[PDB]
Amino acid sequence: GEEQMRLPSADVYRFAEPDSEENIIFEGIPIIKAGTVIKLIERLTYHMYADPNFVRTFLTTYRSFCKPQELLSLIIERFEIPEPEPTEADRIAIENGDQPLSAELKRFRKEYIQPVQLRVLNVCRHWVEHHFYDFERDAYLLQRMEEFIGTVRGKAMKKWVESITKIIQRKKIARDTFQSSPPTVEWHISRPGHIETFDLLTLHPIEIARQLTLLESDLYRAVQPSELVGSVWTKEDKEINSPNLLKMIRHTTNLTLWFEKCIVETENLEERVAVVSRIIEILQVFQELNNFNGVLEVVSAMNSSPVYRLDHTFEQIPSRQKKILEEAHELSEDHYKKYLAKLRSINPPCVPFFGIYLTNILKTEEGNPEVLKRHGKELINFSKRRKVAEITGEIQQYQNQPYCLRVESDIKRFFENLNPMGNSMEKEFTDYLFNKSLEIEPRNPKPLPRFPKKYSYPLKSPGVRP
């Protein structure tokens, strides 16, 4: 009918075929459940209406079903719409040197070409504003984009190309505050500048939790939603696709294993009790600062196979410290029911627990198919990508929460350069920590031997009250 005859032909344009059950599925503006790459590009730049929500989700998750170079090629192809031939009367008019009426041509330009071309430029604008890392990783992709927007010609196009260029240059320049003063940097045995003496018991427990909270807050903020889509941090290409996310995981692994190392490598029972007691105090300050990432790193260390079995150590831990640690584990029970209720009720700033998002994203990635088949044709399951994008939205909700705490470069460097494993691998190092646990506290039939002290300085804690 008239409705399809107005649109371009399939032999000159791929984004004008009619919708059908074997190319697009849906769950006002309709929500797309699934579709082919072409139908998703068509709807990403639809002529009848703007769709900010779909544009957001598409540019966060597209890399799981389409490469950046391919997406750029597709939207340029969509922008290049062929105009219809003049009507028979208008071709007689043109062949006679007269101006044609061109009534349908003028309408097709106003109601289809101009809106689609403006929607393609909106996609380019959101792409460089919220996902510039695609262009930093691929310099060939940036020069292709700049050649395209640079050759665009038009009245309304003029303002759009200028704003896209303004963003690109501002992002290029980006590659090259608090109402209150921060509290006083606390010191215990180690004096400022004496980096050689820095360790768990020599540094102040308040300042350890403060500097780790600043470090973990900075790491949490650097992660981009795209680093988590398609489980790309578990794939072969992860150092370039998930650089910030891997630093967050590696820090959590290094710190959790460092706490375990500090515990099992302290063979004297009474000294080991003071180490555990100090790590619990460090967790108390993480609770004060609403750093749930830090609280659940300590819980992870206390629940590990080498530390959880040290019954003689936790027997000497006061009941108050025991209750603090027990309630911290309760944060994780019932699929983090208590943690989530706490996170929603607290006042900012905070560092949310990051592992729950990776867990829930991997469950969605494994529990939903990549495609949906209909009439023998495979369609990209876009709702799968939308569910993952909603979880990464929860992550962004807390990435604008800086802390009024003074940075101490020597202490920051100590926690950044943590290397408990040394030249050993994780499986081999955890085997060592468990075998060490059995040495310091043997299994029931075997007796409990005594070991010599290793710390020359005093073991008493200065506390957590500043």
320 binding ligand S3Z? (CB under 6 A): no
User: DSSP states of 213-266 as a string?
Assistant: HHHHHHHHHH--GGGGGGGTTSSSS-TTTSHHHHHHHHHHHHHHHHHHHHHHT-
Q: Residue from 308, 426, 449, 453 that binds ligand S3Z (CB under 6 A)?
A: 308
CB-CB neighbours of 200 under 10 Å: 18
Closer to ligand S3Z by CB, 369 or 442: give it.
442
Closer to ligand S3Z by CB, 40 or 299: give it.
299
DSSP 83: P
Helices (DSSP H) in 309-462: which residue ranges?
311-315, 319-330, 333-345, 355-367, 382-396, 409-416, 426-440
Closer to ligand S3Z by CB, 36 or 303: give it.
303
Closer to ligand S3Z by CB, 54 or 259: give it.
259
Question: Which structure tokens are listed for 199?
Answer: 């360790």
CB-based burial of residue 105 (10 Å sphere; 0-12 exposed, 13-18 middle, 19+ buried)?
middle
Closer to ligand S3Z by CB, 241 or 313: give it.
313
33 binding ligand S3Z? (CB under 6 A): no
Closer to ligand S3Z by CB, 168 or 302: give it.
302
Give how far Cα 211 sits from Cα of 177, 186, 208, Å. 18, 11, 5
Question: Which structure tokens are listed for 420?
Answer: 């408990």
Piece of 106-114, 162-170, 326-334, 385-393 that binds ligand S3Z (CB under 6 A)? 326-334
Question: Which structure tokens are listed for 177?
Answer: 């505050």
Question: Which of helix, strand or coil describes residue 26?
Answer: strand
Q: How far is the CB of 301 from ligand S3Z (least distance, A)?
A: 9
CB-based burial of residue 241 (10 Å sphere; 0-12 exposed, 13-18 middle, 19+ buried)?
buried
Q: Residue from 27, 70, 326, 416 that binds ligand S3Z (CB under 6 A)?
A: 326
User: DSSP states of 178-223 as a string?
Assistant: -SSPPPPPP-SSSPTT-GGG--TTTS-HHHHHHHHHHHHHHHHHH-
**Strand order from edge to edge, sheet including 24-26:** 24-26, 32-35, 377-381, 371-374
Mask 284-303, x = binds ligand S3Z (CB under 6 A)?
---------------x--xx
Q: How far is the CB of 398 from ligand S3Z (least distance, A)?
A: 24
Q: How far is the CB of 137 from ligand S3Z (least distance, A)?
A: 40
Query: Which H or E run contains 294?
Result: helix 292-303
Closer to ligand S3Z by CB, 163 or 253: give it.
253
CB-CB neighbours of 440 under 10 Å: 21
Piece of 223-231, 236-244, 323-331, 349-357 that binds ligand S3Z (CB under 6 A)? 323-331
Q: How far is the CB of 60 from ligand S3Z (least distance, A)?
A: 35
Q: How far is the CB of 396 from ligand S3Z (least distance, A)?
A: 29
Length of the chain: 466
Q: How far is the CB of 307 from ligand S3Z (least distance, A)?
A: 6
Closer to ligand S3Z by CB, 314 or 432: give it.
314
Piece of 259-267, 289-297, 321-329, 438-446 that binds ligand S3Z (CB under 6 A)? 321-329
CB 407 within 8 A of CB 276: no
Q: How far is the CB of 52 from ligand S3Z (least distance, A)?
A: 44
Q: Residue from 81, 168, 215, 325 that binds ligand S3Z (CB under 6 A)?
A: 325
* Alpha carbon of residue 358 to chain centroid: 9
Question: Which structure tokens are listed for 133?
Answer: 């890392």
Piece of 65-73, 130-138, 166-174, 322-330 that binds ligand S3Z (CB under 6 A)? 322-330
Query: Distance between CA atoms of 134 and 394, rounded to whole angstroms?
Result: 22
Q: How far is the CB of 430 from ligand S3Z (least distance, A)?
A: 15
Closer to ligand S3Z by CB, 201 or 280: give it.
280
Closer to ligand S3Z by CB, 107 or 337: give it.
337
User: DSSP states of 423-449 as a string?
Assistant: TS-HHHHHHHHHHHHHHHS--TTS---
User: How many residues bind ligand S3Z, per CB under 6 A?
Assistant: 12
317 binding ligand S3Z? (CB under 6 A): yes
Q: How far is the CB of 263 from ligand S3Z (least distance, A)?
A: 10
Q: How far is the CB of 308 from ligand S3Z (least distance, A)?
A: 5
Per CB under 6 A, contacts with ligand S3Z among 329-348 are 329
Closer to ligand S3Z by CB, 6 or 329: give it.
329
CB-CB neighbours of 148 under 10 Å: 18
Give the interface with ligand S3Z as residue ranges (CB under 6 A): 299, 302-303, 307-308, 314, 317, 322, 325-326, 328-329
